[model samples]
Target: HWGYGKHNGPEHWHKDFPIAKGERQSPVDIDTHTAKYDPSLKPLSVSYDQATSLRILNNGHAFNVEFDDSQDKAVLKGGPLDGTYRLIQFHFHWGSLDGQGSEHTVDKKKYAAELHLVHWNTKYGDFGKAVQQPDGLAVLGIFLKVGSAKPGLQKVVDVLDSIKTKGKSADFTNFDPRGLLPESLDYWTYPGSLTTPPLLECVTWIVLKEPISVSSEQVLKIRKLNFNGEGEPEELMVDNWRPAQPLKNRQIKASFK
Candidate 1:
């Protein structure tokens, strides 16, 4: 399977998924100095119903908190998006230790971790069909810093013990993901593809400027999750982040000064 391993890392993804080398690949370096400040950019509008959260699963890649996307129970609008987008799932990518795993870097500086909230445009029918189109997805990237314990993340961290192995899942409900976001909604946006294969070039990336804090203990608990299932040789699920891609001709726009 494709992973952040020596034999099958981001550098070799193009061998299987040709689009990995596409013009609009994601997780690029955000150079704030050169980023265009757009005065016309609108503030983000986020509304997530606590009950929309369904279950949490360990997909061997990362732990994802799935949501009920049907009828837009939780949605993101405004910002750089053209239409309403429904939240499908949210996941994270971290390193073996602190200060390294974020996919998107700022001024060439890496963060402790990164969180991705995956959303799909409702105009294109459903997520399955929309993901194939040019304007199919909208992903919100939030950076994580090592600090005091985040009370909002307590519920999510409490369940890691139950799903230490890949493919393990448990009931996770009434958890509002908005609690994980930082107070400032200012963000940097650009056109990019999924960090993973099939690396679709249909995402409008909105990466927040402010980062949320999580204790080192919380980060360690997440690092303990195994990549392999029950009987497979224990493979630590750390450093599962993609390296920054080249920004050929794309422009990074900022919503605030």
Candidate 2:
């Protein structure tokens, strides 16, 4: 129900996709010196079967995957962290081109884009009920840089040809999303709010310092997703990322080890 057009893109995300504007937004770009880190922020093993039933949704502003609990195959469990949560959904924030598309920053450096893998605590039963709780969510962050070649993202990008215009989405079936993860699990942990509107403050954020790469052409192709109807010419879905915000005394802990 979305097309790639002015105001219809990221700028108007809260209006079109109200959930995105929720208080628990993420992808915060700030530096956290975690010389002394907590062992609880460690990542658990991610299984392929855990992500098989992943449902791709084009919520106007971005494309996200809703994890299927029915499958019980692909599960994202939290570490010994104080909060309890499970992987629920994942999505991206990008720019029109590959030059600048990231929402989170590290020591002031911005990557091309950022991918958010969201999870909800089982204590909440489901995402709906979890979103209401103060500490019900966790989001893993991955930074995407522009590279010379397409980093085998065809699993999702290949479907672009079908949903070229705005508000259009196709099922990204039988895809292995774990394949997209960067090998390095070393990360930064912080208590932050969602990057978009309604900006919830109940999220436990895990942002990886190491980044992954995507082809420049792939970046452009992502920007090509239409913002309007078939009759209207396709507009660039470029620069869908929000600027970094002030940390406001928040502490970010980096896991160097």
Candidate 3:
């Protein structure tokens, strides 16, 4: 029921999900001016198996490509994490325009979009249980800026037509999400919440400093997906991102100076 409409957008989210007003809420501005360089943070490690990819769905929020988490086939470890976190799904947040869509902004700068690779600590046993505990989830956030076409992203754009309406999902198998990651893994880490509702303050956010590229042409294609459910009045799914919340008392740490 929570959509990005004016009546029920991010600002009103606190009404339903109290954690929306809780400390450590996500998608804060990454103010490099005050960010401290931490020598203790390890280099982030990512390992994945293309076969683990299962399906892509338009769940009336954003489209997501889910993965097989039954095994350690795709796991993220090291870098601000004490144990392995299994990759469960990956999704995007975008704006109606090219200039301002990303959830987390750098120095108050918004990218064309943002990609979140959602994972859960294996120590938790299940993704559902992980979203409630403070240290149970780790989300790798990557910014997508406008540039020349990226083949990796084009693969996803190629599938947009198949899932143009909400609740529609298509078989999307053997796809490697690493193709969506940027060249450098340098990142800023913080304790944050899910940008969307339930707005749980459970995520350890790893937002990469380097942004991957996407073309203006590609953005036009993605706009084809409808935000409404199958038989409801059609609305284009854009600006599905929440605005930056207050930074409260938490510290934002950088992996590199």
Candidate 4:
């Protein structure tokens, strides 16, 4: 009953969380409606020198990057994006037990998984404190698709072997996450919440309709990465993705023009 696969995957997420039945959940199936929301398009600029020390942390759930920490500081500066925002934690959400992954959907089509790049506004001075605010965050959602095998994901996937067990982790230093971004910056924007607990409803969601593809083996690898780091032994983090939520009155718009 609690496994991830084609028929029994995220589609059943609502059963576990009744709130999922309500409007405004995640993994929304975009239908390409031509509504003009006209949210401001702000450019985000940064200095490589200020952001030279990006650190990749092998958090048990996903491989994440923490900027401006004692270990590293990938400081970003200047851009239409308020200079007040600072990079926080980056993680991902995926389907359970099968190939269908991703948190947001397009016209009801689900991908293999979704990666979240979370950042917080400096108005709060610290990432910890900002997370509790209403307009304290920006989240970039990248969709993943199952495709031919490629080594591009190795930088993140390689670390999985070390954390395969559970409750165990390894520190990754000097890794740049920008390397994982797909070539297309074209995206859809909206207001949403964290797909996980505390489900904070204070996020500026930037979802790219174009998805990146990884080998089927890589999809398998993601399924193997445990919520706990290597060595804890329970179940592989095979299906950490939440199911699709209902769309409230909220409108999602894209900047393709």
Return the top candidate by lDDT. Answer: 1
lDDT of 3 at 13: 87
Q: Which residues of candidate 2, in runs, are more than 4 Å off?
A: 1-26, 32-36, 80-84, 148-152
Tens digits of per-residue lDDT for model 3, 27-130: 99999989999999999999875438899999988999999998888888899998999999999999889998999999999999999999999888899999
Q: Candidate 1 — what's its lDDT?
A: 0.92
Candidate models: Cα lDDT each: 0.92, 0.66, 0.91, 0.63
TM-score of 4: 0.77
The sequence of per-residue lDDT tens digits that candidate 2 reaches over residues 65-175 is 666654345555544355445666677888765567788887678788888877776777877776666676777888999875545476677677776664666776567
TM-score of each: 0.98, 0.81, 0.98, 0.77
lDDT of 1 at 248: 91
Q: Candidates sorted by TM-score, descending order?
A: 1, 3, 2, 4
- Per-prediction tally of clashes: 0, 41, 0, 22
Quality of model 4 by C-alpha lDDT: 0.63
Q: Give lDDT: candidate 3, residue 33.
A: 84
Instruction: Answer with 3 or 4, whichever has the higher lDDT.
Output: 3
Whole-model alpha-carbon lDDT for candidate 3: 0.91
